[PDB]
Every structure is written in structure tokens, then in C-alpha cells.
Amino acid sequence: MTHSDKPYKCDRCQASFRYKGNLASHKTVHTGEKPYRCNICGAQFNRPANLKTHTRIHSGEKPY
Numbered sequence: 056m057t058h059s060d061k062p063y064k065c066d067r068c069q070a071s072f073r074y075k076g077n078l079a080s081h082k083t084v085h086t087g088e089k090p091y092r093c094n095i096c097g098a099q100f101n102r103p104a105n106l107k108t109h110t111r112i113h114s115g116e117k118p119y
């Protein structure tokens with residue numbers, strides 16, 4: 056058993072909410088819809104998975 060009654064909570068800080076609209080309202084507080092940005096190229100990503108795959112090219116440790 057575990058505590059869980061806020062399906063719509065900010066997965067960035069302690070803040071939590073039971074409504075999706077409220078979450079969006081709270082998101083305005085952070086002011087920065089750019090979690091990850093590639094300085095090398097300039098691409099913006101909302102997920103680290105894509106960034107990890109993107110780093111694949113930048114992965115300098117085996118040129119050939």
C-alpha cells in the first residue's frame with residue numbers, strides 16, 4: 056500500500072494537484088518550457104530519452 060491521490064502533480068517539485076488544469080496553472084510559475092536544450096546544435100527536448108539518443112552523435116569515445 057502507498058499514498059497516491061494526485062494523478063496531476065508537478066513532476067518537478069513537491070507541489071501536487073488532483074486537476075490537470077490546476078497543474079497547467081502551476082506550470083506557469085516555473086516559466087521555462089525548455090527542460091533540456093542542446094548547446095551544440097540548439098534543439099529543445101521535453102524528455103531526456105530523446106536527448107540521450109541525441110547525445111549518441113555527440114558521444115565522443117569511439118570515432119570509428
Ligand SMILES: [Zn+2]
Pocket residue numbers: 065066067068070081082085
Ligand atoms: Zn512545479
Ligand SMILES: [Zn+2]
Pocket residue numbers: 093094095096097098109113
Ligand atoms: Zn546536438
